[PDB]
Amino acid sequence: MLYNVALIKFKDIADKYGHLTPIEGKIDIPFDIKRVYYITKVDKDITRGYHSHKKLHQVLICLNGSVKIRLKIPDEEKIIELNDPSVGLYIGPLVWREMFDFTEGCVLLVLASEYYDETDYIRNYDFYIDEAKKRFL
Amino acid sequence: MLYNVALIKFKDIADKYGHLTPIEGKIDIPFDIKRVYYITKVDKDITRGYHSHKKLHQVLICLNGSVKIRLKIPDEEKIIELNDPSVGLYIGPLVWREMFDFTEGCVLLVLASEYYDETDYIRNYDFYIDEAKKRFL
Ligand SMILES: C[C@H](O)COCC(COC[C@H](C)O)(COC[C@H](C)O)COC[C@@H](C)O
Ligand SMILES: Cc1cn([C@H]2C[C@H](O)[C@@H](COP(=O)(O)OP(=O)(O)O)O2)c(=O)[nH]c1=O
Numbered sequence: 196m197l198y199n200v201a202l203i204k205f206k207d208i209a210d211k212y213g214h215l216t217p218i219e220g221k222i223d224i225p226f227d228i229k230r231v232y233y234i235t236k237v238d239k240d241i242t243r244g245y246h247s248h249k250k251l252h253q254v255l256i257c258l259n260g261s262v263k264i265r266l267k268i269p270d271e272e273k274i275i276e277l278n279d280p281s282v283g284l285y286i287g288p289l290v291w292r293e294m295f296d297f298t299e300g301c302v303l304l305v306l307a308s309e310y311y312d313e314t315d316y317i318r319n320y321d322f323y324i325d326e327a328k329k330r331f332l
Numbered sequence: 333m334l335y336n337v338a339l340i341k342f343k344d345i346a347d348k349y350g351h352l353t354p355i356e357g358k359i360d361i362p363f364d365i366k367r368v369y370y371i372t373k374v375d376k377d378i379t380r381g382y383h384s385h386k387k388l389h390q391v392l393i394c395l396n397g398s399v400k401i402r403l404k405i406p407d408e409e410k411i412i413e414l415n416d417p418s419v420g421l422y423i424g425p426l427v428w429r430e431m432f433d434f435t436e437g438c439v440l441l442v443l444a445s446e447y448y449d450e451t452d453y454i455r456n457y458d459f460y461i462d463e464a465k466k467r468f469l
């Protein structure tokens with residue numbers, strides 16, 4: 196069971212003028228968008244991430260190219276490749292992630308429920324396991 | 333000159349792991365994000381747009397590739413090429429726009445101040461110029 200994770204399907208409005216996916220805060224995703232960020236130009240052998248959050252809710256969306264997201268909780272690990280812009284990966288609190296195999300020119304957009312707060316990140320895998328084992332076991 | 337438009341510069345957090353640009357509503361941009369949408373897979377000879385808005389505020393960002401934005405208000409026209417993910421084109425009310433020259437792989441993100449409202453759009457060019465003449469002249 197990969198708790199606290201979902202794949203959310205967005206509208207894809209396509210005709211001869213291209214494709215357009217809209218995402219409205221609290222409607223298409225469950226939370227209000229306080230912040231967005233996006234990661235570009237990642238080299239092919241980079242893994243990034245190596246963190247969880249305590250309170251943040253987030254949605255990951257690969258808008259070009261492809262990227263693989265490795266998700267861990269105590270005793271499970273699942274790899275999800277994102278390669279469709281109409282699909283978002285919801286990740287709740289206390290899921291550990293790492294991202295790798297970003298293609299050229301892969302674009303990974305994140306919608307976040309809160310402003311950037313370094314103190315809400317768990318960057319220590321040992322602390323992570325320690326807080327997570329309490330939640331998931 | 334071209335009223336109600338700005339270029340906004342965002343952080344670019346660049347290192348060996350790649351590049352990351354964050355945008356926090358009301359901080360990096362002047363409004364809350366209620367809605368984001370994105371345009372992709374647009375063919376090379378397509379022109380998108382041909383409208384204005386009455387009340388919406390929005391920011392345009394090209395996250396991969398390049399796209400040109402033709403902006404017009406009565407008596408004034410400017411073409412802006414967007415090709416830097418760390419640069420946002422803020423467009424306020426009553427500017428007419430058209431988007432063209434989407435490159436292969438181009439991703440155009442829009443941050444919007446309101447949920448989609450087809451009644452806020454001005455799609456009739458003659459009603460646009462009539463309303464804009466009232467404001468800018
Ligand atoms: C270059 C090396 O191969 C990468 O090693 C990754 C790391 C974490 O994985 C934790 C989870 C099981 O995946 C290995 O640590 C062992 C423990 C946590 O001390 C820590 O690296 C963080 C850096 C890359 O920012
Ligand atoms: C996500 C985010 C990061 N940053 C900073 C924090 C980090 O030092 C750097 C990279 O963030 P980090 O979250 O470590 O990136 P990733 O998940 O891709 O590994 O950017 C901000 O200033 N604002 C933000 O919203």
Ligand SMILES: Cc1cn([C@H]2C[C@H](O)[C@@H](COP(=O)(O)OP(=O)(O)O)O2)c(=O)[nH]c1=O
Pocket residue numbers: 208215217218367369371380381382448
């Ligand atoms: C921007 C937006 C458009 N749409 C729909 C309305 C239109 O039928 C279609 C195309 O939108 P439009 O804004 O008309 O496209 P552009 O300015 O890129 O030419 O998508 C939404 O459903 N939600 C949105 O947020």
Ligand SMILES: Cc1c[nH]c(=O)[nH]c1=O
Pocket residue numbers: 382404457
């Ligand atoms: C000049 C002009 C006329 N008609 C349009 O629809 N757009 C334009 O930009």
